[PDB]
Design an enzyme around this catalytic site. Structure first.
Site, PDB file in Angstrom:
ATOM      1  N   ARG A  48       0.876  -1.008  -0.086  1.00 19.46           N
ATOM      2  CA  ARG A  48       0.208  -0.167   0.048  1.00 19.46           C
ATOM      3  C   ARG A  48       0.801   1.379   0.067  1.00 19.46           C
ATOM      4  O   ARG A  48       0.484   2.497  -0.511  1.00 19.46           O
ATOM      5  CB  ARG A  48      -0.884  -0.006   1.071  1.00 19.46           C
ATOM      6  CG  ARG A  48      -2.119  -1.220   0.951  1.00 19.46           C
ATOM      7  CD  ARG A  48      -2.530  -1.340   2.441  1.00 19.46           C
ATOM      8  NE  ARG A  48      -3.876  -2.412   2.288  1.00 19.46           N
ATOM      9  CZ  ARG A  48      -3.719  -3.501   2.209  1.00 19.46           C
ATOM     10  NH1 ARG A  48      -2.664  -4.287   1.865  1.00 19.46           N
ATOM     11  NH2 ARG A  48      -4.937  -4.413   1.785  1.00 19.46           N
ATOM     12  N   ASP A  78      -3.127 -16.004   7.563  1.00 21.14           N
ATOM     13  CA  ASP A  78      -2.000 -16.375   7.104  1.00 21.14           C
ATOM     14  C   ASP A  78      -1.354 -17.274   7.920  1.00 21.14           C
ATOM     15  O   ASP A  78      -0.212 -17.853   7.683  1.00 21.14           O
ATOM     16  CB  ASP A  78      -1.206 -15.507   6.597  1.00 21.14           C
ATOM     17  CG  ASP A  78      -1.830 -14.595   5.224  1.00 21.14           C
ATOM     18  OD1 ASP A  78      -2.793 -15.331   4.592  1.00 21.14           O
ATOM     19  OD2 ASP A  78      -1.602 -13.583   4.916  1.00 21.14           O
TER      20      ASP A  78
HETATM   21  O1  S3P Z   1      -4.920  -6.969   1.900  1.00 21.49           O
HETATM   22  C1  S3P Z   1      -3.717  -7.621   2.332  1.00 21.49           C
HETATM   23  O2  S3P Z   1      -2.492  -7.057   2.440  1.00 21.49           O
HETATM   24  C2  S3P Z   1      -4.065  -9.034   2.583  1.00 21.49           C
HETATM   25  C3  S3P Z   1      -5.134  -9.596   3.003  1.00 21.49           C
HETATM   26  C4  S3P Z   1      -5.369 -11.345   2.818  1.00 21.49           C
HETATM   27  O3  S3P Z   1      -6.097 -11.777   1.929  1.00 21.49           O
HETATM   28  P1  S3P Z   1      -7.638 -11.789   1.674  1.00 21.49           P
HETATM   29  O4  S3P Z   1      -8.406 -10.611   1.610  1.00 21.49           O
HETATM   30  O5  S3P Z   1      -7.922 -12.790   0.502  1.00 21.49           O
HETATM   31  O6  S3P Z   1      -8.054 -12.433   2.741  1.00 21.49           O
HETATM   32  C5  S3P Z   1      -4.098 -12.007   3.508  1.00 21.49           C
HETATM   33  O7  S3P Z   1      -4.114 -13.408   3.540  1.00 21.49           O
HETATM   34  C6  S3P Z   1      -2.941 -11.569   2.490  1.00 21.49           C
HETATM   35  O8  S3P Z   1      -1.656 -12.336   2.527  1.00 21.49           O
HETATM   36  C7  S3P Z   1      -2.791  -9.898   2.166  1.00 21.49           C
END
Ligand code: S3P
Length: 445
Positions: A28, A321
């Site tokens: 981001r 995760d």
């Molecule tokens: O927005 C993010 O930085 C993330 C959100 C999660 O995914 P999901 O939105 O599919 O749950 C996570 O598992 C990924 O490693 C990173």
């Protein structure tokens, strides 16, 4: 191609180390820094492959990105200023970069194509492409809404109110980013809270974004589109997901005392810590403080005896995760650890529920894989665990499967081998060096 690695039983892990930057915030930082007006300066950025790919995609759309000393400096194009990319945007292994960028640029009136590696190309994009279709974006995708995908935004996008159907911060994020170039108010309704880096960072960049939480926990996030975003100074905290590896290793390897510095402690990211504490882990939270606008602390972790626990479906989003490394910890806990609400694991870098269950079984662990759950029974002394024959765990191009099983080998009676360590650099290039510095014995083929 592939490069197997084997982890061997280790003597106590010991040391104090700073963990690499948070991947979610790093992605981001490049995205918002590249979109905002003026200069953005970032310290602590994670330089794993996933983040570098997001940076290259932003450069492809007009942002100037460079590294001066230990600071990344970005000259943004201003909200509404993204330029049409010349070639497909290659996100490699990164769904975060891919899905968020789909929302960000899909609403612009030019074509954008998205591609990725063998792992990313099998993952579902429908969850983000559907709301984009409601906003007026034209979508061309492969069957099942898989990559490659080409988007073409309308002249004037349509703002929507979208209730996210699964607990995905990426879907929430993609809709909010699309809202940045959409006139009117974009609203995302999140029934179950997910990591909130997008909301916090957009507010920090000056967006008129509000979050209201009902007493029942439902979040209503409103964003006014086409507003100015201003470059910022960002200090990225340590990645709590990366921290999980040396942290669980220190809990399991006898004679260990490891301190991890500057760890992000936002509660949407700490479900594993809470779970391990309930299992009896000795994790001390030191000097909790505010850094870069986020909660951080140092964590001192000492060898602990663990007992199995029941992990409720509602805690899952806060540690999604970390299920692979939690499963490995459970393999050495007294009794059964039961984890449900795991459907989302099946659509990650690998189907993590299947990969973890198969890897545990290959290494002698008693476990039961359900459609959306996992039960693991442990062997505290590690006897009979691991794989004496040297058989390799199938990682399925998933860095967390590789790292979790390498941690297991530091504890099991028999070594644990993974079929490939090459993808670890997508999120934690420092892994081998960091673990070796603490005393871990990991042989790279
Ligand atoms: O927005 C993010 O930085 C993330 C959100 C999660 O995914 P999901 O939105 O599919 O749950 C996570 O598992 C990924 O490693 C990173």
């Amino acid at each position: 191609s592939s490069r197997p690695a084997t982890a061997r039983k280790s003597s106590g892990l010991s040391g104090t180390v700073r963990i690499p930057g948070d991947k979610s915030i790093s992605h981001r930082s490049f995205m918002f820094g590249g979109l905002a007006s003026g200069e953005t300066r970032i310290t602590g950025l994670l330089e794993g492959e996933d983040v570098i790919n997001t940076g290259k995609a932003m450069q492809a759309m007009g942002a100037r990105i460079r590294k001066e000393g230990d600071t990344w400096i970005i000259d943004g194009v201003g909200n509404g200023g993204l330029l049409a990319p010349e070639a497909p945007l290659d996100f490699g292994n990164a769904a975060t970069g891919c899905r968020l960028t789909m929302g960000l640029v899909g609403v612009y009136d030019f074509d954008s194509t998205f591609i990725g590696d063998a792992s990313l190309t099998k993952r579902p994009m429908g969850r983000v492409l559907n709301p984009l279709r409601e906003m007026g974006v034209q979508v061309k995708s492969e069957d099942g809404d898989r990559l490659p995908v080409t988007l073409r935004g309308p002249k004037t996008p349509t703002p929507i109110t979208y209730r996210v159907p699964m607990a995905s911060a990426q879907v929430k994020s993609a809709v909010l980013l699309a809202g940045l170039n959409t006139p009117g108010i974009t609203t995302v309704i999140e029934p179950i809270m997910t990591r909130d880096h997008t909301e916090k960072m957009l507010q920090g960049f000056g967006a008129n974004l509000t979050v209201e939480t009902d007493a029942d926990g439902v979040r209503t996030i409103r964003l006014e589109g086409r507003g100015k975003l201003t470059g910022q100074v960002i200090d990225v905290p340590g990645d709590p997901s990366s921290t999980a590896f040396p942290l669980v290793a220190a809990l399991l390897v006898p004679g260990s005392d490891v301190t991890i510095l500057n760890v992000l402690m936002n509660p949407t990211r700490t479900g594993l810590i809470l779970t391990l504490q309930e299992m009896g882990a000795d994790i001390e939270v030191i000097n909790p403080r505010l850094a870069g606008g986020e909660d951080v602390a140092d964590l001192r972790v000492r060898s602990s005896t663990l007992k199995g626990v029941t992990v409720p479906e509602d805690r899952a989003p806060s540690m999604i995760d970390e299920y692979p490394i939690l499963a490995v910890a459970a393999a050495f806990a007294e009794g059964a650890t039961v984890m449900n609400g795991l459907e989302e694991l099946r659509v990650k870098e690998s189907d993590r529920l299947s990969a973890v269950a198969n890897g545990l079984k290959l290494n002698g662990v008693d476990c039961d894989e359900g459609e959306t759950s996992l039960v693991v029974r442990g062997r505290p002394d590690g006897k009979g665990l691991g794989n004496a024959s040297g058989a390799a765990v199938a990682t399925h191009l998933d860095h967390r499967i590789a790292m979790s099983f390498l941690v297991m080998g530091l504890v099991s009676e028999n070594p644990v081998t993974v079929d490939d360590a090459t993808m670890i650099a997508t999120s934690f290039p420092e892994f081998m060096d960091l673990m070796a510095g603490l005393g871990a014995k990991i042989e790279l083929s």
